[PDB]
């Protein structure tokens, strides 16, 4: 029997800062126990200061990104070159995904950018289009390895102030772009150590009011 | 939904400093029966592209006709059909990739794995993969089926990353490809000794080599091997 | 849903229908009215798959109300039951059939007679002195076979109905949270608010 | 999941948890399970998250079109039936939905409709849906009165979700409260279950089984 | 898992990677897959890890007793015969796939063994999920009359092919060299090409960060005198 | 249906400078239903500590079994069993049920009384030994624990620093697992003193 | 056939003596002398290789035997009985210990196992 | 697998390819499928490698013990022992074995034992997946009382075709010659037999 | 069978167990006592597959009574529960396992403390202040979590138990025909004949 | 079924057995499996009789209509029409067809269309259940540019062996010769070919 779905592995991570946002993902593409590519870009600049990644089954992932990029193009044509806001992009993606409710895009989608007040924004989608704005979201193979670490180190969960013994929580102080990138790199380094589908390279896209910037880092190739 | 009937095995390929190399054997298997011994599975499109196909042969022959039709169609009302508006490897791939994904999305796939190898207008090497699921990926080395498991490890020792491509000559690349084909003949039960090899170079163009054979094989050591454990005679 | 009973006496038809609505593990409601008034002198109770029951009942109600306005005339219980049977007989060979069983209790103003029709989801119609759907008949029919007379009063019918409900409450494993009872006669449809 | 809604003297209380799970894996603790259909209507989300999101936002569009055409607020009866008729068309296809459509109008008063993906549409006073529904029902049934104050009713809804969050493994994270009045709904905050549990334990004397 | 065995001039060498996995998760990053059956008979195991370690200890135990009974040093063919008859009896349910190598008074030997009880003879062998990557290297570079240094080089290169290309294999290369008329030399972590880079941050917490309800001393000592 | 995830729970063990730490959650459940918040999963036989995750009936059965066996060991050997020896005994005992196994994920922790060397080990349900230098994880949130431990851990932590590291590893892993939590215990083990600490955590 | 001797061949005499054990000890008394001495950093065991014939190769007859890598044994009395005891002792060191604990038994416990085998030949049928 | 045994004037010759596959992967390309159960009684194995190795080992044990008591066994006796194991354990075995041997009284004999555990004495026998493709060729070309050189050519040509068409067969062609003169092993490489 | 509850208060253990026995379609009995007295101060209630429940309970009873005679001594509740757990833990890997869940309520005369143990058919034992088997806990635990105090009197325990049974009777689909309640304390075991 | 087509010096010859079975029952022992789609373009059928008859009838219709408009079709054209039907309806067909024909420009040509719907132009082709047993024989004995008498002997001997070993094949050997001279039918009975 023909199985229309597959699993190309990969892991992605979106974090929203105070006036910035990052969307990172490893560059390894796989089937079963084989490596297809050590560098296959997974996070894409879609225009209008929006970055996107559709992790999971790479064919559906590529199709969805392609269709969203196309939606941005036609949004400009139809509405006098108006900038597509991150919240509007998110709602649009829901309809793209739910359109195939009964033959879904087998992907976990994340987008990142800035909201209309200039603050950092990350949106997270399931395969059939349910979505939510979030501060922190890992997706894909090693998501279960990364999220608990982020709960502890970004939101300071289970951390209290010394001397008070559980009475006062550690205050939620804002993180800089340099601080976030450190946590992203350590998340993927740790994921690479313990998950076989994670490795080769890490590509991070950083979104600010100035535009989209890229950073690449080597990961272990075993 | 179907099942493949007459099938072709591994297609292997890699980038080198001035272009790309691609190779595939000339066998059309019918299950374990090695039925057809003169099947060409590398199909050139113009003078800048070679499409290598594995999997179902009837679907290969269909894809072959689509590419033939693509060349005809591109020439229509096109004075620059043999110049600026000729078919690029990137155009040919994107078309195939569209077809493959559409077909899987109708639950009626073309049961193939395809590698498009070529050189672009600006001299850039093109090497990308697509299969029956519509999955696509690029790499300095690419291979299908058994080639993925056995050829890639060998080819990756020559070009391990992007920066190794300018350091790799056509002689070294062809040598590595030919050796991989020998290894596949040793170890793939659905392979044959006869194969085809194509080189697409930005300077010397498309060189298509037919009727190649696996040679320099090691078998002599077999004479000393006796029994399965305790037997001496 | 679960238990729906019907009994035709001398001058009226009495329909009893359970109040429970269970969605799996919890009883979501204990006051559900599993009936629709099709016309002033025609009442239909129903039981079957969730959603389909009310959808079908309201669809029938709309059609009978449409007929009533068009002709300025109330269809006979027999005519209404024949319409309902055809809809279910059509439904059974559809892509997705209505999984609904009904009892139609009406008073024919022309003949001055009460009438009770039992129709299952296949479109199997029978006119009866008393009827039920599901397992309800298994517990109650032996009592109805014994005590039923065609010349019973409405009060005697209600007493025989109480005995049937008591037997159900004793031997049935499920708690159906009692029944809503309605009477159909020459003066129309009314609900017995204490049962 | 645990979602509840109940009618009372002061209108409707809606209370939900915040947890979403994929098997044993806790995907999210910050899920918004109350959909704001418009400023007057609320819907709860249980079953398929996408199905509830997509179709209850769509419901908001249909309600807006109704009041543009009819120059009048849509009834809770009519709004709930638009949704139940829609999902009934999809019956068999695999939609998963268990929701309470909540509203407060002049002609109806406070009204709650349980709407289901098998096509069920039930009017009622107290509804409770999700994996932790049985736990919340216990607290509701034993403490519910029509003449509850808005303050006490809000607490009852909060306490009932807490009861479920504690016992049901697939419920937790935080509690979202809403109070529906005739002039519209009013949001009554996000309450972390972790902090709420210890607070309630001390102040109420409950959960003596747990060491704090 | 990637495991290889290579014959050479005066003996045999076996090698293996050091990654053990449950599904897609790496359980141990420095696993020891080279097992000792007897001082100069070593084997490497792929498949169900408990079965490979369990079956090598059982045969290794019986081999030791046999060596004491017969006053002779154990032979590789004995280990082979005992392993295959045990595995055949259990009809593949004991999921042990082994490459057995060693030296004895008869000479140097190299065998493979599949879980159902079938055995094979060869000058070079590979087993496990990375066996195809390893065999590609072996088929490209193997020749007759290899030296000790050439065989160690070939064996480790074959394991490296598995490490880099097979997701089921990784971390380090273990090697064991068994030469005729010599002690077998076990080279644990012969190669170490996968050391983790320094993290960007230290995650050492301030003392008193964790909330505590109760403290108590645990009595690990026995009942006291007096 | 899956026996190893009916009851839920987790165990984690770490090594430090002249010390080891082992920790567990306190939950026992029947799938979605929470049943007990006092189900401890760490036991000790002399100075050797054993954590067990998985099917609770087997957790209880194995504890009673290893108490049985270590008691007879002590009577015959005239000394308490060591971590290295006990590890082999657990492995032996599990593999004897190769084709009808206990659905468990044991974890050994302790300090060798003679050498003073810290020791930890893990097993699959069938007896395969995982002897890691750094840490061992087990249970329904093992993936989460691997993620926490891999980033939080550093070698040669002092006892009171190791406590913070292992506690934060457990807590944050358990909060991302539906079937773990409802309290937690941490053992800090030195050559001749052991401290047991119950942690305050969210009760959902 | 079948072993129809299911009863004890060693029994208490009226005086409380176990005859067969006493007689076994008499056979030990006739045996060639062997000895053992314990030092602070080692132990030594020794005996005479009483060769039955000069044509016999007495190196092929081992009176001193390795039981485990750290345990050795020597005897006085009947050689064949010793040989089979060494076989049983070597095996029991594995079956009742090494295959359980992954290490060789301590001297006192292996001795205990050998003693148990000898005790059973004193009571079994 | 492609295996065959052929009787001729001076005795019998066994022939086999050397390919063993796990699916489409060639697990061993230099396999020895000609196995010795006695000095001048050999067999060709097809089917489950574990099963046929287990059976052959047991037969070798039985014939060794037979020889110690009753002297050299006949080829018929060896075939009977093979059959007894295959027939009685037919439910749990996948084995197709050809037994070939040389007596001085009986000369060259060939027995084939297919899946069921039946025995068939034949002038020559073919078996294994690749044998299907050479039923026509072998039937047309086999003659009785061929010479050693003719029988080697017959087997070499036959297995050459079997290898050519069957993907499960390949590698080298191994042969074992059984005559009064003794036991001779032959090997033929791809470059030789492919050009035939 | 269906619902079995347990609650340990200050000075006693209270076990509540349903009276209904349903064999598929009919309720065959509405006065069934799903409990056995193992010893003068130890009571065990049970629920599970038909036949196995009583067979197991009586088997345990016989064994504890045998121990009591042999030693002229009553085993502690803890000891009895450990015996029962082992039997079930043995049973789960048998050819045909006992499909039986139990609650053991006892008063330890040595420690002067009530004790409640919950053991499922797998041999999963837990000591609790209050417990249940099947779906009973889903409805009742939220009430018990709220109202339970360790210093409750027997009368307060019974009142909290009534509230639990009322919630069960409201929201459960099945009619379990009420409960038989028994109290275990220092004076032994007695039945509350009006509940 | 045993079917084959062989090109030779003067054109091409098609050959076939005559046995059609329903399980082990021979439903027809005198079947004509050589079917005419045009004057000098014939085909051999294997697989579902209903399917191959339906396909052949449609092809004959297509080539008749082709001829009315564009004159005599090539053998390649006929094969393409066969392929189009077999490939596009692969999910619902079980057909293995060999197409053989004679042009004056191209002379004798043979095309085989296996299950999948692929096309392969060959010097000769074999198909049907019985073809498996003669891959070896046919490969060893086929030569290009044989005479008419040699090609008849080659086919007669080949199908003789296929019939001998395949239970699904049997009866008479039918042949059809396609040359410039015209169309000649040949038949060979069991008593003739069995003694070969
Ligand atoms: Mg990795
Ligand atoms: Mg919870
Ligand atoms: Mg077998
Ligand atoms: Mg949790
Ligand atoms: Mg071949
Ligand atoms: Mg329990």
UniProtKB/Swiss-Prot annotation, chain A:
One Gene Ontology term from the biological process aspect of the record: proteasome-mediated ubiquitin-dependent protein catabolic process
Coiled-coil segments on the chain, per record: none
InterPro entries linked: Ntn_hydrolases_N, Proteasome_bsu_CS, Proteasome_sua/b, Proteasome_suB-type
Localization (cell): Cytoplasm; Nucleus
Key words of the record: Cytoplasm, Nucleus, Proteasome
GO CC list: cytosol; nucleus; proteasome complex; proteasome core complex, beta-subunit complex
Family the UniProt entry places it in: Belongs to the peptidase T1B family.
Assembly and binders: The 26S proteasome consists of a 20S proteasome core and two 19S regulatory subunits. The 20S proteasome core is composed of 28 subunits that are arranged in four stacked rings, resulting in a barrel-shaped structure. The two end rings are each formed by seven alpha subunits, and the two central rings are each formed by seven beta subunits. The catalytic chamber with the active sites is on the inside of the barrel.
Name of the protein: Proteasome subunit beta type-6
Organism: Saccharomyces cerevisiae (strain ATCC 204508 / S288c)
Gene encoding the protein: PRE7
UniProtKB/Swiss-Prot annotation, chain B:
Main subcellular localisation: cytoplasm
Assembly and interaction partners: The 26S proteasome consists of a 20S proteasome core and two 19S regulatory subunits. The 20S proteasome core is composed of 28 subunits that are arranged in four stacked rings, resulting in a barrel-shaped structure. The two end rings are each formed by seven alpha subunits, and the two central rings are each formed by seven beta subunits. The catalytic chamber with the active sites is on the inside of the barrel. Interacts with CIC1.
UniProt protein name: Proteasome subunit beta type-7
Single Gene Ontology BP annotation: proteasome assembly
Keywords: Cytoplasm, Nucleus, Proteasome
InterPro entries xrefs: Ntn_hydrolases_N, Proteasome_beta4, Proteasome_bsu_CS, Proteasome_sua/b, Proteasome_suB-type
Gene name as annotated: PRE4
Main function: Non-catalytic component of the proteasome which degrades poly-ubiquitinated proteins in the cytoplasm and in the nucleus. It is essential for the regulated turnover of proteins and for the removal of misfolded proteins. The proteasome is a multicatalytic proteinase complex that is characterized by its ability to cleave peptides with Arg, Phe, Tyr, Leu, and Glu adjacent to the leaving group at neutral or slightly basic pH. It has an ATP-dependent proteolytic activity. PRE3 and PRE4 are necessary for the peptidyl-glutamyl-peptide-hydrolyzing activity.
Pfam families per record: Proteasome
Swiss-Prot record, chain F:
A single GO BP: proteasome-mediated ubiquitin-dependent protein catabolic process
Cross-referenced InterPro entries: Ntn_hydrolases_N, Proteasome_beta_3, Proteasome_bsu_CS, Proteasome_sua/b, Proteasome_suB-type
Location(s), subcellular: Cytoplasm; Nucleus
The keyword Cell division belongs to this UniProt entry's keyword annotation: no
Cross-link (Glycyl lysine isopeptide (Lys-Gly) (interchain with G-Cter in ubiquitin)): 69
Keywords linked to the UniProt accession: Cytoplasm, Isopeptide bond, Nucleus, Phosphoprotein, Proteasome, Ubl conjugation
SUPFAM superfamilies reported for this sequence: N-terminal nucleophile aminohydrolases (Ntn hydrolases)
GO CC terms of this entry: cytosol; nucleus; proteasome complex; proteasome core complex, beta-subunit complex
UniProt-recorded Gene Ontology molecular function terms: endopeptidase activator activity
Modified residues (Phosphoserine): 30
Main location: cytoplasm
Function field: Non-catalytic component of the proteasome which degrades poly-ubiquitinated proteins in the cytoplasm and in the nucleus. It is essential for the regulated turnover of proteins and for the removal of misfolded proteins. The proteasome is a multicatalytic proteinase complex that is characterized by its ability to cleave peptides with Arg, Phe, Tyr, Leu, and Glu adjacent to the leaving group at neutral or slightly basic pH. It has an ATP-dependent proteolytic activity. This subunit may participate in the trypsin-like activity of the enzyme complex.
UniProt xrefs under PANTHER family: METALLOPROTEASE TLDD (PTHR32194), PROTEASOME SUBUNIT BETA TYPE-3 (PTHR32194:SF10)
Similarity comment: family membership: Belongs to the peptidase T1B family.
Protein name: Proteasome subunit beta type-3
Organism expressing this protein natively: Saccharomyces cerevisiae (strain ATCC 204508 / S288c)
Swiss-Prot record, chains H, J:
GO molecular function, one term: endopeptidase activity
Localization: Cytoplasm; Nucleus
Residue spans crossing the bilayer: none
GO cellular component: cytosol; nucleus; proteasome complex; proteasome core complex, beta-subunit complex; proteasome storage granule
Domain of life, per lineage: Eukaryota
Record-linked Gene3D superfamilies: Glutamine Phosphoribosylpyrophosphate, subunit 1, domain 1 (3.60.20.10)
InterPro entries cross-referenced by the UniProt entry: Ntn_hydrolases_N, Pept_T1A_subB, Proteasome_bsu_CS, Proteasome_sua/b, Proteasome_suB-type
EC annotation from Swiss-Prot or TrEMBL: 3.4.25.1
Any Gene Ontology biological process: proteasome-mediated ubiquitin-dependent protein catabolic process
One Pfam assignment: Proteasome
CDD domains: proteasome_beta_type_6
Reaction(s) catalysed (UniProt annotation): Cleavage of peptide bonds with very broad specificity
Keywords for the protein's UniProt record, in alphabetical order: Acetylation, Cytoplasm, Hydrolase, Nucleus, Protease, Proteasome, Threonine protease, Zymogen
Top EC class, one word: hydrolase
Active-site residues (renumbered): 1 (nucleophile)
Major place of residence: cytoplasm
Extra remark: The side chain of Thr-1 acts as a nucleophile, and the N-terminal amino group acts as a proton acceptor.
Family listed: Belongs to the peptidase T1B family.
PANTHER family: ATP-DEPENDENT PROTEASE SUBUNIT HSLV, METALLOPROTEASE TLDD
Subunit structure: The 26S proteasome consists of a 20S proteasome core and two 19S regulatory subunits. The 20S proteasome core is composed of 28 subunits that are arranged in four stacked rings, resulting in a barrel-shaped structure. The two end rings are each formed by seven alpha subunits, and the two central rings are each formed by seven beta subunits. The catalytic chamber with the active sites is on the inside of the barrel.
Gene that produces this protein: PRE3
């Amino acid at each position: 029997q023909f199985n229309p779905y597959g699993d190309n592995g990969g892991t992605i991570l979106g974090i929203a800062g105070e006036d910035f946002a990052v969307l990172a993902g490893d560059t390894r593409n796989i089937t079963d126990y084989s490596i297809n590519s050590r560098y296959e870009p997974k996070v894409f600049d879609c225009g209008d200061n929006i970055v996107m990644s559709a992790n999971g089954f790479a064919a559906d992932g590529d199709a969805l990104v392609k269709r969203f990029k196309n939606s941005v193009k036609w949004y400009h044509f139809d509405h006098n070159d108006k900038k597509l806001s991150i919240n509007s992009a998110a709602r649009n993606i829901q309809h793209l995904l739910y359109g195939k409710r009964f033959f879904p895009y087998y992907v976990h989608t994340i987008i990142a950018g800035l909201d209309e007040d200039g603050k950092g924004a990350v949106y997270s989608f399931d395969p059939v289009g349910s979505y939510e704005r979030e501060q922190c979201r890992a997706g894909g193979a090693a998501a279960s390895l990364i999220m608990p670490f982020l709960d502890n180190q970004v939101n300071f969960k289970n951390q209290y102030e010394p001397g008070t013994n559980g009475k006062v929580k550690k205050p939620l102080k804002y993180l800089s772009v340099e601080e976030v990138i450190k946590l992203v790199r350590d998340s993927f380094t740790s994921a690479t150590e313990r998950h076989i589908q994670v490795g080769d390279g890490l590509e991070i896209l950083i979104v600010t009011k100035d535009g989209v910037r890229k950073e690449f880092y080597e990961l272990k190739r075993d | 939904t179907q099942q493949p009937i007459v099938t072709g095995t591994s297609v292997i390929s890699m980038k080198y400093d001035n272009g790309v190399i691609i190779a595939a054997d000339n066998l059309g298997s019918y299950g374990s029966l090695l039925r057809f011994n003169g099947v060409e599975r590398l199909i050139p499109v113009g003078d800048n592209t070679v499409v290598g196909i594995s999997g179902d042969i009837s679907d290969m022959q269909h894809i072959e006709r689509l590419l033939k039709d693509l060349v005809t169609e591109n020439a229509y009302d096109n004075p620059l059909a043999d110049a600026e508006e000729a078919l690029e490897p990137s155009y040919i791939f994107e078309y195939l990739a569209t077809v493959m994904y559409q077909r899987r999305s109708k639950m009626n796939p073309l049961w193939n794995a395809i590698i498009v190898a070529g050189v672009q207008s600006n001299g850039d090497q093109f090497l990308r993969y697509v299969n029956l699921l519509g999955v696509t990926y690029s790499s300095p080395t690419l291979a299908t089926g058994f080639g993925a498991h056995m050829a890639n490890p060998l080819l990756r020792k020559v070009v391990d990353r992007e920066s190794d491509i300018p350091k790799t000559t056509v002689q070294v690349a062809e040598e590595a490809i030919v050796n991989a084909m020998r290894v596949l003949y040793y170890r793939d039960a659905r392979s044959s000794r006869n194969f085809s090899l194509a080189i697409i170079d930005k300077n010397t163009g498309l060189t298509f080599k037919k009727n190649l054979q696996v040679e320099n094989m090691k078998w002599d050591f077999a004479k000393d091997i006796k029994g399965y454990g305790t037997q001496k005679i | 849903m679960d238990i729906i009973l019907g009994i035709r006496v001398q001058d009226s038809v009495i329909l009893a229908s359970s109040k429970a609505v269970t969605r799996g593990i919890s009883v979501l409601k204990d006051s559900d009215d599993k009936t629709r008034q099709l016309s002033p002198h025609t009442l239909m109770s129903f039981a079957g798959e969730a959603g389909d029951t009310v959808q079908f009942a309201e669809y029938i109600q709309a059609n009978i109300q449409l007929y009533s306005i068009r002709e300025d005339y109330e269809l006979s219980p027999q005519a209404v039951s024949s319409f309902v049977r055809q809809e279910l007989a059509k439904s059974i060979r559809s892509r997705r059939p209505y999984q609904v069983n009904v009892l139609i209790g009406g008073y024919d103003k022309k003949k001055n007679k009460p009438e009770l029709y039992q129709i299952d989801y296949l479109g199997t119609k029978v006119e009866l002195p008393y009827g039920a759907h599901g397992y309800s008949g298994f517990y109650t029919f032996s009592l109805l076979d014994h005590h039923y007379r065609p010349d019973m009063t409405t009060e005697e019918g209600l007493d025989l109905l109480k005995l049937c409900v008591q037997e159900l409450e004793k031997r049935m494993p499920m708690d159906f949270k009692g029944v809503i009872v309605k009477i159909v006669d020459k003066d129309g449809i009314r609900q017995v608010d204490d049962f | 999941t645990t979602t509840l809604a109940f009618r009372f003297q002061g209108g409707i209380i809606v209370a939900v948890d915040s947890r979403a799970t994929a098997g044993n894996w806790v995907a999210s603790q910050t899920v918004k399970k109350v959909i704001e259909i418009n400023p007057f209507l609320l819907g709860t989300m249980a079953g398929g998250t996408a199905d509830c999101q997509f179709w209850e936002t769509w419901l908001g569009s249909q309600c807006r079109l109704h009041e543009l055409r009819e120059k009048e607020r849509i009834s809770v009866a009519a709004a709930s039936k638009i949704l139940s008729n829609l999902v009934y068309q999809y019956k068999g296809a695999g939609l998963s939905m268990g929701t309470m459509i909540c509203g407060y109008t002049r002609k109806e008063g406070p009204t709650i409709y349980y709407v289901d993906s098998d096509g069920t549409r039930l009017k009622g006073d107290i509804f409770c849906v999700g994996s932790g529904q049985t736990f919340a029902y216990g607290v509701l049934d034993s403490n519910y009165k029509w003449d509850l104050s808005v303050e006490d009713a809000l607490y009852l809804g909060k306490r009932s979700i807490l009861a479920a969050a504690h016992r049901d493994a697939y419920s937790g994270g935080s509690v979202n409260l809403y109070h529906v009045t005739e002039d519209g709904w009013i949001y009554h905050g996000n309450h972390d279950v972790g902090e709420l549990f210890w607070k309630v334990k001390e102040e109420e004397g409950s959960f003596n089984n747990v060491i704090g | 898992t990637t495991i290889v065995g290579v014959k050479f001039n005066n003996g045999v060498v076996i090698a293996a990677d050091t990654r053990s996995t449950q599904g897609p998760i790496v359980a141990d990053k420095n696993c020891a897959k080279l097992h000792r059956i007897s001082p100069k008979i070593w084997c490497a195991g792929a498949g169900t890890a408990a079965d490979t370690e369990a079956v090598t200890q059982l045969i290794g135990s019986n081999i030791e007793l046999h060596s004491l009974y017969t006053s002779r040093e154990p032979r590789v063919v004995s280990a082979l015969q005992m392993l295959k008859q045990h595995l055949f009896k259990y009809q593949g349910h004991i999921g042990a796939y082994l490459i057995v190598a060693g030296v004895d008074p008869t000479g140097s030997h190299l065998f493979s063994i599949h879980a159902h009880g079938s055995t094979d003879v060869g000058y070079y062998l590979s087993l496990g999920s990375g066996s195809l990557a390893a065999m590609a290297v072996l088929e490209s570079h193997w020749k007759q009359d290899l030296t000790k240094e050439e065989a160690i080089k070939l064996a480790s290169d074959a394991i490296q092919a598995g490490i880099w290309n097979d997701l089921g294999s990784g971390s380090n290369v273990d090697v064991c060299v068994m030469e005729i008329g010599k002690d077998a030399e076990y080279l644990r972590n012969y190669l170490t090409p996968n050391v983790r880079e320094e993290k960007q941050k230290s995650y050492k917490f301030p003392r008193g960060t964790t909330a505590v309800l109760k403290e108590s001393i645990v009595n690990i000592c026995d009942i006291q005198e007096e | 249906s899956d026996p190893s995830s009916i009851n839920g729970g987790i165990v984690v063990a770490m090594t430090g400078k002249d010390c080891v730490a082992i920790a567990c959650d306190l939950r026992l459940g029947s799938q979605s239903l929470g049943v007990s918040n006092k189900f401890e999963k760490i036991f000790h036989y002399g100075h050797v500590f054993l954590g067990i995750t998985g099917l609770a009936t087997d957790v209880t059965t194995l504890n009673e079994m290893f108490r049985y066996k270590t008691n007879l060991y002590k009577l015959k050997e005239e000394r308490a069993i060591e971590p290295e020896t006990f590890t082999q005994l657990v492995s032996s005992s599990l593999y004897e049920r190769r084709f009808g196994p206990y659905f468990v994920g044991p974890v050994v922790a302790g300090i060798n009384s003679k050498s003073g060397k810290p020791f930890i080990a893990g097993f699959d349900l069938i007896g395969c030994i995982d002897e890691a230098k750094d840490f061992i994880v087990s249970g329904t949130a093992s993936d989460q624990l691997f993620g926490m431990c891999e980033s939080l851990y550093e070698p040669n932590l002092e006892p009171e620093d190791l406590f913070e590291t292992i506690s934060q590893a457990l807590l944050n892993a358990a909060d991302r697992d539906a079937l773990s939590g409802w309290g937690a215990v941490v053992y800090i083990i030195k050559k001749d003193e052991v401290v047991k600490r119950y942690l305050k955590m969210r009760q959902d | 056939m079948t072993d129809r001797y299911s009863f004890s061949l060693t029994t208490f005499s009226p005086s409380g003596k176990l005859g067969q054990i006493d007689y076994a000890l008499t056979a030990v008394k006739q045996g060639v002398t062997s000895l053992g001495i314990k030092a602070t950093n080692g132990v030594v065991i020794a005996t005479e290789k009483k060769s039955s014939s000069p044509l016999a190769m007495s190196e092929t007859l081992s009176k001193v035997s390795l039981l485990t890598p750290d345990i050795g044994a020597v005897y006085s009395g009947m050689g064949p009985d010793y040989r089979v005891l060494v076989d049983k002792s070597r095996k029991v060191a594995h079956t009742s210990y090494k295959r359980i604990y992954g290490e060789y038994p301590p001297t006192k416990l292996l001795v205990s196992e050998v003693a148990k085998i000898m005790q059973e030949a004193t009571q079994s049928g | 697998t492609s295996i065959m045994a052929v009787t001729f004037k001076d005795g019998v010759i066994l022939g086999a390819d050397s390919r063993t596959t796990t699916g489409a992967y060639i697990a061993n390309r230099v396999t020895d499928k000609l196995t010795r159960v006695h000095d001048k009684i050999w067999c060709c194995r097809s089917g489950s490698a574990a099963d046929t190795q287990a059976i052959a080992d047991i037969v070798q044990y039985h014939l060794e013990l037979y020889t110690s008591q009753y002297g050299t066994p006949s080829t018929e006796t060896a075939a009977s022992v093979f059959k007894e194991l295959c027939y009685e354990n037919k439910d749990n075995l996948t084995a197709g074995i050809i037994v070939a041997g040389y007596d001085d009284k009986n000369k060259g004999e060939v027995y084939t034992i297919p899946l069921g555990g039946s025995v068939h004495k034949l002038p020559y026998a073919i078996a294994g997946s690749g044998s299907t493709f050479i039923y026509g060729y072998c039937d047309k070309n086999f003659r009785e009382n061929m010479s050693k050189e003719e029988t080697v050519d017959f087997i070499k040509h036959s297995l050459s075709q079997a290898i050519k068409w069957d993907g499960s067969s390949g590698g080298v062609i191994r042969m074992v010659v059984l005559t009064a003169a003794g036991v001779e092993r032959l090997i033929f490489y791809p470059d030789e037999y492919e050009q035939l």
